[PDB]
Amino acid sequence: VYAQEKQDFVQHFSQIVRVLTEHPEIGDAIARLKEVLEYNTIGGKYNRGLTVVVAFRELVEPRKQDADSLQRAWTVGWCVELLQAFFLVADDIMDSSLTRRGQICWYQKPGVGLDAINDANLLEACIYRLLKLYCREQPYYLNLIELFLQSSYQTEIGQTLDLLTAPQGNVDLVRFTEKRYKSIVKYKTAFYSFYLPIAAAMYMAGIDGEKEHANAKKILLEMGEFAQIQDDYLDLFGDPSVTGKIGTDIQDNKCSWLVVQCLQRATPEQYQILKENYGQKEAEKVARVKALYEELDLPAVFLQYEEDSYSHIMALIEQYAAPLPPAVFLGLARKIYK
Amino acid sequence: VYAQEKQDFVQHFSQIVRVLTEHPEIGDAIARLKEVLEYNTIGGKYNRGLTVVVAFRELVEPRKQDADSLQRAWTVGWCVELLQAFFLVADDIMDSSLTRRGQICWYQKPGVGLDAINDANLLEACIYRLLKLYCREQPYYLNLIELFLQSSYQTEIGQTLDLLTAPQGNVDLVRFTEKRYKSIVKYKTAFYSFYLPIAAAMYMAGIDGEKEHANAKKILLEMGEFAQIQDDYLDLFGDPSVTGKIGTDIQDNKCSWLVVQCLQRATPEQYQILKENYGQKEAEKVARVKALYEELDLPAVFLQYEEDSYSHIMALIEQYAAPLPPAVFLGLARKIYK
Numbered sequence: 319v320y321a322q323e324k325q326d327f328v329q330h331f332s333q334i335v336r337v338l339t340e341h342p343e344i345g346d347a348i349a350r351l352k353e354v355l356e357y358n359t360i361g362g363k364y365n366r367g368l369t370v371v372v373a374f375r376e377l378v379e380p381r382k383q384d385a386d387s388l389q390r391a392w393t394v395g396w397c398v399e400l401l402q403a404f405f406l407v408a409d410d411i412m413d414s415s416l417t418r419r420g421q422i423c424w425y426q427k428p429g430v431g432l433d434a435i436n437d438a439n440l441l442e443a444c445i446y447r448l449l450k451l452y453c454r455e456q457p458y459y460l461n462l463i464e465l466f467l468q469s470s471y472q473t474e475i476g477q478t479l480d481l482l483t484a485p486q487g488n489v490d491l492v493r494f495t496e497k498r499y500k501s502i503v504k505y506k507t508a509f510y511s512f513y514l515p516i517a518a519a520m521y522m523a524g525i526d527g528e529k530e531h532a533n534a535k536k537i538l539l540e541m542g543e544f545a546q547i548q549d550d551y552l553d554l555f556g557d558p559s560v561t562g563k564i565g566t567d568i569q570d571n572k573c574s575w576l577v578v579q580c581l582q583r584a585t586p587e588q589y590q591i592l593k594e595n596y597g598q599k600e601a602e603k604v605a606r607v608k609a610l611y612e613e614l615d616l617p618a619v620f621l622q623y624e625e626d627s628y629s630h631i632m633a634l635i636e637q638y639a640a641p642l643p644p645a646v647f648l649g650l651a652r653k654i655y656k
Numbered sequence: 657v658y659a660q661e662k663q664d665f666v667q668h669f670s671q672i673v674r675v676l677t678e679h680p681e682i683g684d685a686i687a688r689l690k691e692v693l694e695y696n697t698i699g700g701k702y703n704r705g706l707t708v709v710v711a712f713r714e715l716v717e718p719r720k721q722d723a724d725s726l727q728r729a730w731t732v733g734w735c736v737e738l739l740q741a742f743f744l745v746a747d748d749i750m751d752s753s754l755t756r757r758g759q760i761c762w763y764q765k766p767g768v769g770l771d772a773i774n775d776a777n778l779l780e781a782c783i784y785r786l787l788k789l790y791c792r793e794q795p796y797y798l799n800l801i802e803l804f805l806q807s808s809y810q811t812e813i814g815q816t817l818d819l820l821t822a823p824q825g826n827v828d829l830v831r832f833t834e835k836r837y838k839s840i841v842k843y844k845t846a847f848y849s850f851y852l853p854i855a856a857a858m859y860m861a862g863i864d865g866e867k868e869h870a871n872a873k874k875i876l877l878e879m880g881e882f883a884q885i886q887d888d889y890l891d892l893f894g895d896p897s898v899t900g901k902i903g904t905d906i907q908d909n910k911c912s913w914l915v916v917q918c919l920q921r922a923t924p925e926q927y928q929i930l931k932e933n934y935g936q937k938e939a940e941k942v943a944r945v946k947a948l949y950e951e952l953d954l955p956a957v958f959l960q961y962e963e964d965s966y967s968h969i970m971a972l973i974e975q976y977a978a979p980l981p982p983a984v985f986l987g988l989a990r991k992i993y994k
């Protein structure tokens with residue numbers, strides 16, 4: 319059922335590429351756009367895009383789910399996937415990453431390099447091309463434009479906080495606090511990965527009320543915090559065959575949930591070990607940090623946190639889901655918790 | 657009068673920064689946004705922003721130029737300056753440039769580096785923040801949003817053509833044609849630098865007709881082609897004390913107007929000299945190309961072209977300006993021709 323939902327969503331990508339790549343003077347640039355789309359918008363789990371499609375189906379009366387409305391829903395889900403693609407192509411450059419979704423990062427491909435900066439911006443531009451082509455006559459068109467623009471700004475402010483807290487070649491242990499961590503992840507991840515897909519489906523379903531969006535946001539931003547904590551845990555302890563990418567948080571001096579938890583539990587001797595080995599390229603220094611995390615039983619702390627987080631998000635669904643179907647939030651929680 | 661217009665426009669920047677930098681959790685990111693704005697949106701000529709302000713004043717009845725409408729006009733002119741800033745910060749990374757507006761490029765500043773990618777995207781995001789804060793209740797709000805989004809897409813397609821025609825470490829003389837050149841510059845420069853500022857003032861003045869915008873575009877895209885040809889000429893023959901930047905077109909293997917003109921005039925012996933020396937970092941190779949350009953009297957070809965271009969644009973103003981005041985176009989031509 320879930321594998322079928324994913325296959326159904328991916329089968330719409332060929333039409334998305336077709337409409338985006340249809341004077342002959344820009345032909346060569348349009349061929350490059352097609353290559354950028356095929357490399358960077360495919361290969362992920364499609365959690366955000368599928369959330370738009372399933373939430374729309376659960377929020378709109380089936381008699382109103384005609385062929386054109388369903389096409390608009392699939393198209394807006396692909397818009398969120400294009401936003402994800404834009405963020406990841408640029409993030410991989412700024413984080414000096416090597417692989418993404420089981421292949422070399424686009425910018426690391428021979429012949430691409432920093433031209434990937436413009437390619438990332440083309441992916442973002444395609445969102446607004448698709449919204450104009452399919453949604454311009456709809457009453458929610460401006461709501462969707464402003465929602466995507468706001469989500470991009472919030473993510474970029476979060477990325478600024480992430481990069482400021484992680485200066486290259488400078489110790490920043492003093493700034494690795496739970497308060498700083500929560501702000502980084504709320505802005506860099508929670509808004510675009512959890513609030514945006516549900517909010518887009520809500521606007522398409524005619525649910526535009528400030529209070530209903532605020533209540534959904536209460537659940538979704540908390541889900542988003544867990545998703546980034548899980549991402550931080552997997553950066554170091556995930557299987558690369560499963561995650562599809564190589565971790566860089568320790569080398570990049572990141573304010574990861576792991577280092578925040580390490581600092582809260584470390585003895586003065588362990589603090590000194592972290593200070594001397596964190597945020598540096600040397601593989602033996604990275605191994606020393608991982609050994610410290612294992613000595614402090616951080617994988618067990620993460621598993622206990624996942625349990626407590628799940629119970630907290632479920633309690634927030636009980637408080638704030640109404641009048642929306644709880645299934646809207648439960649289905650998204652299922653995608654991130656196991 | 658013109659120096660006074662520039663000073664009046666720059667005096668509004670402090671309020672632009674104030675409104676964009678006003679929870680305390682993102683405080684550190686907002687301080688970085690202020691630094692990005694002060695470094696990258698100031699120091700230029702403000703030709704695009706001033707065009708919005710002067711064209712609005714010339715297109716709107718003075719009785720309708722109340723304090724709030726004039727504020728909206730200044731704000732939209734600063735939005736075009738933020739779009740310029742976004743494009744330049746990223747272009748300087750992709751072109752491996754050293755200086756911009758008389759100072760080191762933002763990405764070359766110690767401590768910035770490739771974090772400049774996210775900084776560039778923050779500048780673009782501020783456009784939509786300003787349009788929502790000052791223009792959301794106006795009838796032209798959606799027209800302006802779509803105009804800025806379209807101008808960004810066109811510029812990015814042009815940047816793709818520019819970078820595809822200029823592969824690093826590969827000879828691309830065969831693709832340096834007048835037809836390829838005209839397409840690159842129409843998309844990368846002409847739309848955002850000439851059509852966007854006038855079109856924004858037209859929409860704010862209530863001039864939204866397809867035919868009127870098409871007629872203005874006929875003049876403006878041709879002006880834009882000359883502006884990029886002049887930029888290409890100055891890359892090599894301009895005084896850096898005046899241009900504020902160091903040229904990189906020869907080292908970067910760019911489809912510059914100069915190399916297009918060189919190829920049209922070169923003997924087979926000169927073609928071989930260009931083939932062996934173009935698109936390479938070696939200063940002696942760059943000097944060989946410049947000497948070839950001087951041997952082919954390319955500065956004289958440029959001066960004759962500037963004369964013929966000016967007469968052509970003036971003939972297009974005579975054909976297509978009506979019903980707009982010709983002063984709208986003449987004032988912009990004055991900014992680029994001497």
Ligand SMILES: O=P(O)(O)C(O)(Cc1cccnc1)P(=O)(O)O
Pocket residue numbers: 405406409410413415473477506507549553
């Ligand atoms: O996929 P990644 O690189 O682990 C990541 O989650 C990517 C990302 C990019 C933009 C916003 N949020 C997450 P990061 O935050 O760099 O750890």
Ligand SMILES: O=P(O)(O)C(O)(Cc1cccnc1)P(=O)(O)O
Pocket residue numbers: 743744747748751753811815844845887891
């Ligand atoms: O200022 P520059 O770098 O000479 C330039 O004009 C900058 C630019 C950036 C984006 C679009 N158009 C021009 P380029 O095209 O790279 O020669």
Ligand SMILES: C=C(C)CCOP(=O)(O)OP(=O)(O)O
Pocket residue numbers: 361362363364365402419507511545546549
């Ligand atoms: C915000 C985060 C954690 C970045 C990765 O998101 P995903 O794990 O959803 O990545 P893909 O499925 O799109 O590859």
Ligand SMILES: C=C(C)CCOP(=O)(O)OP(=O)(O)O
Pocket residue numbers: 699700701702703740757845849883884887
């Ligand atoms: C599109 C071009 C030619 C890039 C530079 O524009 P300007 O010459 O207007 O640059 P600033 O005044 O903003 O520095």
Ligand SMILES: [Mg+2]
Pocket residue numbers: 409410413415
């Ligand atoms: Mg990353």
Ligand SMILES: [Mg+2]
Pocket residue numbers: 409413480
């Ligand atoms: Mg990152």
Ligand SMILES: [Mg+2]
Pocket residue numbers: 549550553
């Ligand atoms: Mg990560």
Ligand SMILES: [Mg+2]
Pocket residue numbers: 747748751753
């Ligand atoms: Mg450049």
Ligand SMILES: [Mg+2]
Pocket residue numbers: 747751818
């Ligand atoms: Mg360039």
Ligand SMILES: [Mg+2]
Pocket residue numbers: 887888891
């Ligand atoms: Mg140039």
